[PDB]
Amino acid sequence: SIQKIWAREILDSRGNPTVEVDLYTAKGLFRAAVPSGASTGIYEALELRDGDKQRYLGKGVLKAVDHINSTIAPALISSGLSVVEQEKLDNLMLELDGTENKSKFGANAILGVSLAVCKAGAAERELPLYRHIAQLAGNSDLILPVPAFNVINGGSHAGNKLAMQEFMILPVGAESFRDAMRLGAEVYHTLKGVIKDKYGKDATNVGDEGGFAPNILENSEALELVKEAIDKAGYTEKIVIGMDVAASEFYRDGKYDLDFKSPTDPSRYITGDQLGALYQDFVRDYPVVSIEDPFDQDDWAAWSKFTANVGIQIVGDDLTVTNPKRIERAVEEKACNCLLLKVNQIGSVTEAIQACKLAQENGWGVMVSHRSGETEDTFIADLVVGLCTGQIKTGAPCRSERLAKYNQLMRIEEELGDEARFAGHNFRNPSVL
Amino acid sequence: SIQKIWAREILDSRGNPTVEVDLYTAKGLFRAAVPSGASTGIYEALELRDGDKQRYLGKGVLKAVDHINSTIAPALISSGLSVVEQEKLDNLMLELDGTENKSKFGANAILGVSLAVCKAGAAERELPLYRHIAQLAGNSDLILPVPAFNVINGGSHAGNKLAMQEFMILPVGAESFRDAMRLGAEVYHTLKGVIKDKYGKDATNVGDEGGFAPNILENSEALELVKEAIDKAGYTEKIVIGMDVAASEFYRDGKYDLDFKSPTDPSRYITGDQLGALYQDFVRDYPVVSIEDPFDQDDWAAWSKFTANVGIQIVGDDLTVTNPKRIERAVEEKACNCLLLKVNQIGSVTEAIQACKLAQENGWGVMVSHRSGETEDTFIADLVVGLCTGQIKTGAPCRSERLAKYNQLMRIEEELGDEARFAGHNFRNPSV
Numbered sequence: 001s002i003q004k005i006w007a008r009e010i011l012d013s014r015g016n017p018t019v020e021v022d023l024y025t026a027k028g029l030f031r032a033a034v035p036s037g038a039s040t041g042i043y044e045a046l047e048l049r050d051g052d053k054q055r056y057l058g059k060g061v062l063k064a065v066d067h068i069n070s071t072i073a074p075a076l077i078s079s080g081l082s083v084v085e086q087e088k089l090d091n092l093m094l095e096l097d098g099t100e101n102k103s104k105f106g107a108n109a110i111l112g113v114s115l116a117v118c119k120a121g122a123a124e125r126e127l128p129l130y131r132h133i134a135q136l137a138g139n140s141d142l143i144l145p146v147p148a149f150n151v152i153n154g155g156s157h158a159g160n161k162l163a164m165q166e167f168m169i170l171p172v173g174a175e176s177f178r179d180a181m182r183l184g185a186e187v188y189h190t191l192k193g194v195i196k197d198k199y200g201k202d203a204t205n206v207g208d209e210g211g212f213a214p215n216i217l218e219n220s221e222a223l224e225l226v227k228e229a230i231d232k233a234g235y236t237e238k239i240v241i242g243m244d245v246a247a248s249e250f251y252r253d254g255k256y257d258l259d260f261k262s263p264t265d266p267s268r269y270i271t272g273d274q275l276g277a278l279y280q281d282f283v284r285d286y287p288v289v290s291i292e293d294p295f296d297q298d299d300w301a302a303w304s305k306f307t308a309n310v311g312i313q314i315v316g317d318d319l320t321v322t323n324p325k326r327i328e329r330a331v332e333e334k335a336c337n338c339l340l341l342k343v344n345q346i347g348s349v350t351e352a353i354q355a356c357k358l359a360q361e362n363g364w365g366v367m368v369s370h371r372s373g374e375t376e377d378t379f380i381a382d383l384v385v386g387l388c389t390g391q392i393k394t395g396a397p398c399r400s401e402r403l404a405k406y407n408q409l410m411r412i413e414e415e416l417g418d419e420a421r422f423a424g425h426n427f428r429n430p431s432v433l
Numbered sequence: 434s435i436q437k438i439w440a441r442e443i444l445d446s447r448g449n450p451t452v453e454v455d456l457y458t459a460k461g462l463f464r465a466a467v468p469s470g471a472s473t474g475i476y477e478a479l480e481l482r483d484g485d486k487q488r489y490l491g492k493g494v495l496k497a498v499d500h501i502n503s504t505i506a507p508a509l510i511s512s513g514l515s516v517v518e519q520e521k522l523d524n525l526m527l528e529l530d531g532t533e534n535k536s537k538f539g540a541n542a543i544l545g546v547s548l549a550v551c552k553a554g555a556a557e558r559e560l561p562l563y564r565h566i567a568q569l570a571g572n573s574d575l576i577l578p579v580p581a582f583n584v585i586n587g588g589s590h591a592g593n594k595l596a597m598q599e600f601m602i603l604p605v606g607a608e609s610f611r612d613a614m615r616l617g618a619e620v621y622h623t624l625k626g627v628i629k630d631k632y633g634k635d636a637t638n639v640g641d642e643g644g645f646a647p648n649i650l651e652n653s654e655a656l657e658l659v660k661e662a663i664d665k666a667g668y669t670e671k672i673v674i675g676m677d678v679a680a681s682e683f684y685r686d687g688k689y690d691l692d693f694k695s696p697t698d699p700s701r702y703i704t705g706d707q708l709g710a711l712y713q714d715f716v717r718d719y720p721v722v723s724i725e726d727p728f729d730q731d732d733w734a735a736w737s738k739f740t741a742n743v744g745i746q747i748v749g750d751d752l753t754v755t756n757p758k759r760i761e762r763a764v765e766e767k768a769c770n771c772l773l774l775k776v777n778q779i780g781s782v783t784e785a786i787q788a789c790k791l792a793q794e795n796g797w798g799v800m801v802s803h804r805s806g807e808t809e810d811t812f813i814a815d816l817v818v819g820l821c822t823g824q825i826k827t828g829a830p831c832r833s834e835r836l837a838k839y840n841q842l843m844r845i846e847e848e849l850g851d852e853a854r855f856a857g858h859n860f861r862n863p864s865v
């Protein structure tokens with residue numbers, strides 16, 4: 001049983017408060033922290049903030065902390081359940097909150113406990129966390145994911161005009177996860193020089209996720225810079241490109257604004273059809289193999305149309321919000337073919353595992369993801385390996401809220417020894433390996 | 434005794450390889466990682482890189498890792514020394530490398546192990562790491578430091594024209610360490626707005642240490658922006674400024690180039706006397722209370738003249754390189770009055786603590802510091818508390834290789850409960 005829980009406010013990678021939970025068992029102290037998005041979908045579970053303008057401009061999380069310390073902790077201690085019992089403990093908290101969207105305690109309160117319970121459960125089983133998560137999920141043969149590194153940041157994550165949020169490189173042809181890290185970092189460092197030589201050293205500062213934040217508007221230009229760096233590093237055959245458009249961020253009165261960080265001028269807005277044609281040009285002109293959130297979270301007909309007209313991976317993020325109800329609708333409508341898995345969009349480990357299994361049972365890919373506000377926590381590294389999803393995005397190889405996960409995936413690969421397998425070109429469907 | 438030591442390459446906060454060590458005892462696994470500087474003093478102990486231009490652009494650390502796995506690990510295990518014996522185990526590694534500057538294995542090989550030994554030692558003693566470090570140093574009470582947050586980045590840490598490297602805020606009037614965090618973070622976020630209002634969104638991206646990187650050239654404009662942010666956040670009476678000039682980076686032919694990131698033009702170079710005049714104007718016009726590396730690492734005359742003409746804290750960093758022999762010289766010549774403490778400039782925990790003690794015995798402050806390439810390691814948070822230094826600089830409150838240390842200091846303060854003290858206005862001389 002749980003001996004004691006103590007939660008506190010720490011600061012995330014942008015300097016904003018977030019929740020951290022210490023949980024004590026006879027095995028010792030286990031600690032987890034909760035991430036926080038910036039381009040947050042409207043259907044995400046509630047992130048409870050205090051709203052005290054006198055403190056962190058209203059962004060404290062003292063209310064979430066107190067719900068954990070004073071209500072959730074005695075509930076879970078009273079239950080007497082072992083920390084191994086992830087589903088029972090998560091269900092106790094979902095029932096005690098009692099709301100659909102976790103609006104009584106906050107998804108941040110519930111998740112911080114859910115994650116700390118999962119870490120203590122792995123220790124109680126005397127297993128690494130990724131193996132405990134594999135058993136929770138019913139998986140046997142574990143696989144390292146292809147990392148998807150967001151090397152040029154735009155949208156709501158960067159100070160630039162560039163509207164689309166993330167331009168990622170995926171070393172699908174690497175030999176191992178450790179080799180994927182070398183490929184990704186070499187391209188990233190090559191790209192700093194490509195940008196410096198063109199735009200100047202002032203275009204080589206970074207955005208929230210560690211990608212460069214060059215002063216450019218045109219999304220094709222970000223793609224051209226990434227392709228140039230791939231080729232200059234000598235990895236044209238081995239590295240492909242993914243995008244996260246985060247189109248909900250720039251959806252305006254049924255159109256889309258590719259210059260949404262410039263003062264509002266509706267004459268520049270474009271139709272979903274124009275925007276889809278742009279994506280088709282990108283897929284033709286560059287090695288783009290994955291596009292996430294190409295349309296707004298409510299623009300279902302545009303998603304179904306586009307997915308039917310391409311052969312690449314199309315990832316639901318704000319469309320699906322890690323939420324079985326929304327995933328079912330996206331399956332029915334054939335809106336996308338991959339789920340972005342964010343524990344804090346739904347609020348518990350159990351529910352996230354269920355969302356992952358639901359997408360996998362319907363033949364979708366699943367890409368585990370960080371949030372743009374991260375912490376030193378590395379849980380998602382063990383999560384993607386235990387869930388065997390084959391693909392994770394958790395930052396450029398820059399800023400250690402990103403590298404902490406990448407470093408942990410290198411450690412897991414080392415630990416697996418001869419048993420390690422890398423998803424490679426099977427990142428959409430690694431269950432075949 | 435040590436059961437197993439295993440080193441690996443991980444990536445640091447810039448995406449470059451660095452050394453990580455796992456050390457196993459009967460008490461479990463103890464892991465540490467090594468930071469890496471950009472504006473590295475010429476007198477720093479050697480950071481060993483592989484130089485293979487094809488792999489990580491020559492920045493691999495496979496040779497340092499191999500020195501640990503093939504040489505240092507079996508020697509320490511074979512010795513049977515307990516992990517509590519920090520000095521014997523560090524001295525063994527110094528003698529195994531055999532060179533003054535750690536140029537055979539790298540300071541990065543030796544330090545990775547030294548740090549993991551110290552974590553394992555604390556566990557053997559059944560102490561938290563900060564209390565083990567206090568026992569190693571002979572300290573009996575602990576104090577939380579004032580944090581110094583680098584909120585505008587310049588020099589070699591950022592893409593802009595600013596020559597001076599760091600413009601830091603210090604919440605000396607905060608109530609506690611946790612309150613100092615709130616004041617630093619509120620000022621930081623207020624600063625983003627001040628910069629966006631004046632320079633637009635392109636000016637709000639961040640440099641290596643998480644400070645903003647606006648494309649400005651005047652170092653006084655950085656100070657003006659920081660001062661404006663402090664005032665707009667409502668904290669004029671509680672937050673002051675520190676700078677790290679990192680002047681070795683712009684020393685040229687016996688003079689100084691404050692426009693160094695623009696094409697070479699000796700006609701704009703200034704002397705050390707002119708640079709000191711400019712610092713005195715900053716101290717008059719802004720709440721600057723501390724200046725680090727105001728002159729080059731070899732320009733002793735300028736250091737001693739300037740220290741004798743001002744009352745602010747004058748911090749040696751590249752001058753002193755956490756090295757007792759250089760600190761002895763700086764004490765004799767009165768070159769500075771505070772030591773920047775970087776374990777990786779000297780290469781072992783034992784020598785960093787000796788450096789700290791030497792500076793404190795001679796009346797100097799000590800500011801523990803990160804490097805601009807950091808990891809998720811939090812050792813230096815426990816180090817600053819255990820050595821009772823009163824001040825730490827470990828980043829803007831942005832990028833979690835910075836926040837991991839600040840968050841750990843908040844945990845330490847919480848753990849100390851009623852016993853917790855905050856150095857506050859006594860940050861230069863907490864021994865009072």
Ligand SMILES: O=C(O)[C@@H](CO)OP(=O)(O)O
Pocket residue numbers: 036037038039040041166209244246317340369370371372373
């Ligand atoms: O939109 C996204 O996919 C994420 C992760 O990169 O960003 P945020 O956490 O800001 O939603």
Ligand SMILES: [Mg+2]
Pocket residue numbers: 037038039040041246318
């Ligand atoms: Mg988003």
Ligand SMILES: [Mg+2]
Pocket residue numbers: 244246292293317318340
């Ligand atoms: Mg997204």
Ligand SMILES: [Mg+2]
Pocket residue numbers: 470471472473474679
């Ligand atoms: Mg330096």
Ligand SMILES: [Mg+2]
Pocket residue numbers: 677679725726750751773
């Ligand atoms: Mg310095």
